[PDB]
Amino acid sequence: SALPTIPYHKLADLRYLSRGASGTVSSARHADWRVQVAVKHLHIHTPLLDSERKDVLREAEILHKARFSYILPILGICNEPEFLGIVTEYMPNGSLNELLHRKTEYPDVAWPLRFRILHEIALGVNYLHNMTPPLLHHDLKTQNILLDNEFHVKIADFGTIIYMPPENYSIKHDIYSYAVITWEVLSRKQPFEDVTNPLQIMYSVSQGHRPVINEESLPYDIPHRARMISLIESGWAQNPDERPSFLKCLIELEPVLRTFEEITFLEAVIQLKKTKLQS
Amino acid sequence: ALPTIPYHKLADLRYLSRGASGTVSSARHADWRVQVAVKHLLLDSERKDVLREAEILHKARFSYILPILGICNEPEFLGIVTEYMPNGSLNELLHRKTEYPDVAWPLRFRILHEIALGVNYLHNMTPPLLHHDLKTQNILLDNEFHVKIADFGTIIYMPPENYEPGQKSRASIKHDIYSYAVITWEVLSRKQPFEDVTNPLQIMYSVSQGHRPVINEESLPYDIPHRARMISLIESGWAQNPDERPSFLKCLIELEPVLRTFEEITFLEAVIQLKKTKLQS
Ligand SMILES: Cc1ccc(C(=O)Nc2ccc(CN3CCN(C)CC3)c(C(F)(F)F)c2)cc1C#Cc1cnc2cccnn12
Ligand SMILES: Cc1ccc(C(=O)Nc2ccc(CN3CCN(C)CC3)c(C(F)(F)F)c2)cc1C#Cc1cnc2cccnn12
């Protein structure tokens, strides 16, 4: 009702970004708003395009109902014979995944920025869980966490199974994913790197194994290392009932975040952008 | 479509403004764990004025418009909840020279660019929204000094053809751009428009007759980047003839090349400098 319908011909300079499941994510410039945008457009040459339409409108309805500071903001729908899609704000600094694992482009990612990111992911998911009815994400991974021009988090949805809790091979799924993500953020390692076949991963996890917690994985200089290890281990407990709520997580995190002097967040970000611009 | 937030979910309320439509207070939402602003004012008609405002803000979601988070609608309490903007208004940034003694040029242009992006979006809605009360007091600044447009001495932002009220003045499509020109002059000078004249009727008369804030070396110093493109923009914007004034879409197009000369890192640096001086001074 409030959601603009954007004609395809109003979208200029389309550049590919991703080929997600049903179709492509591209960057563009809106000709009248003069801002950059992202657009997710499904393929037109499918026999199952009838249901494709339905999926797109259901997705836009969701994103629109879920407006919030840490959820990717939707700007409109494209709905024409030649072109079907969702338009959102464009996040110039890509995904958390890239931030963590492109060590040539991002050789230092200061601790405060990392805790901010974890705090904001929690704020986002928590808001979804507090909607009426609750929205459950059920596909959290670092690929789905986007970062705006100041490296604030925008949660989205588009190596799969590592973020999945064993009992899904549920109100307690997102928090499992968030624990792995947390391990991932503090370590900058791929969970289960030295492990080829993902069936072996599902088995190991079935049996209670988790990413390794180590001097090698989580070095001893991590601020609040021990509070954070507790959070991770609660979060990915074999028993879903031992895993905490996101609200409990935020409460555990708030004092950790209060330790950082506010200027240090901006300093962490300015450093990153400076190094990124030189790669 | 828009959450209804119970008053008892809002913790630690602290006064901020006693604006037009009610009191504006800061608070913390007990379940979302974020800070918020809340504007709280017949059970027939008072509601409609608030519900009409929330409908507007909700219809107008965009990067540079103040984001509405919900409505409070209870027997004890009626209001609108929005995101909270910790760095106050553009007005404070410009005129509190003790707290903010240097405001680097690039940050200033970014702000101007973003005000234009906001008003432009309003003008492009269906039907168009017209602001008609732009001033520096209504431009808010988020944690990284990005702009959020809002609405809550005054006549200086008003174009002369709106002095005589009516159905002409209301449907004027060229009001916001006049206000934006004065704001622009204000941002580049950090002077009050018409500081020298005591009585605001003499201001209305002078403006009736084509006079505008003074442009020169004292008001707009020679070191302003793109001084001459910017003076042109201001002057087209506040032209006596409404038809010579540009659309905000034209405005943005005139600005885009100016903004492109600043390396993007420079905006963040300007913001760091502010926060450092605000803290160390
Ligand atoms: C164009 C576009 C369209 C849609 C979506 C999208 O995220 N849709 C979405 C669907 C569902 C949900 C919640 N559910 C999860 C599943 N489900 C079981 C529950 C409900 C959410 C969430 F935000 F709420 F999480 C989002 C993102 C983009 C993007 C983009 C973009 C912007 N900058 C860049 C830079 C690089 C790459 N991409 N990119
Ligand atoms: C709680 C709250 C509620 C509402 C509004 C509000 O701005 N409502 C609004 C009404 C109409 C319009 C557009 N129209 C203009 C007239 N009109 C003829 C056309 C339509 C717009 C606009 F933004 F779109 F302009 C906004 C702001 C606040 C705030 C706040 C806040 C947050 N942090 C701080 C820090 C210090 C002080 N305040 N504060």
Author numbering:
A (entry chain A): 8 to 165, 188 to 198, 207 to 316
B (entry chain B): 9 to 49, 55 to 165, 188 to 316
Paste lines from the article.
NOD activation induces pro-inflammatory signaling by receptor-interacting protein kinase 2 (RIPK2, also known as RIP2 or RICK), which plays an obligatory and specific role in activation of NOD-dependent, but not Toll-like receptor responses (Park et al., 2007). Signaling by RIPK2 is dependent on an N-terminal kinase domain with dual Ser/Thr and Tyr kinase activities (Dorsch et al., 2006; Tigno-Aranjuez et al., 2010), as well as a C-terminal caspase activation and recruitment domain (CARD) that mediates CARD-CARD domain assembly with activated NODs (Inohara et al., 1999; Ogura et al., 2001b). Once engaged, RIPK2 is activated by autophosphorylation (Dorsch et al., 2006) and further targeted by XIAP (X-linked inhibitor of apoptosis) and other E3 ligases for non-degradative polyubiquitination (Bertrand et al., 2011; Damgaard et al., 2012; Tao et al., 2009; Tigno-Aranjuez et al., 2013; Yang et al., 2007, 2013). The structure of RIPK2 exhibits the canonical bilobal kinase fold followed by a 16-residue αJ helix that packs alongside the loop connecting the αD and αE helices.
Type II binding is confirmed by the first crystal structure of RIPK2 solved in complex with ponatinib, which reveals an allosteric site suitable for the rational design of RIPK2-selective small molecules. The structure was solved by molecular replacement and refined at 2.75 Å resolution. The bound ponatinib inhibitor occupies the ATP pocket established between the N- and C-terminal lobes of the kinase. As a result, RIPK2 displays an inactive conformation of the catalytic domain characterized by a “DFG-Asp out, αC-Glu in” configuration. The β3 lysine (Lys47) and αC glutamine (Glu66) establish the catalytically relevant salt bridge, whereas the DFG aspartate (Asp164) is flipped away from the active site, rendering the enzyme inactive. The RIPK2 structure reveals a homodimeric packing arrangement similar to that of RIPK3 (Xie et al., 2013b) and consistent with the dimeric state observed in solution by analytical gel filtration. The imidazo[1,2-b]pyridazine head group establishes a single hydrogen bond to the hinge residue Met98 as well as hydrophobic interactions with Tyr97 and Leu24. The central linker forms two additional hydrogen bonds with the side chain of Glu66 and the main-chain nitrogen of Asp164. In particular, the allosteric hydrophobic pocket occupied by the trifluoromethyl group is greatly enlarged in RIPK2 due to the presence of Ala73 in the αC helix.
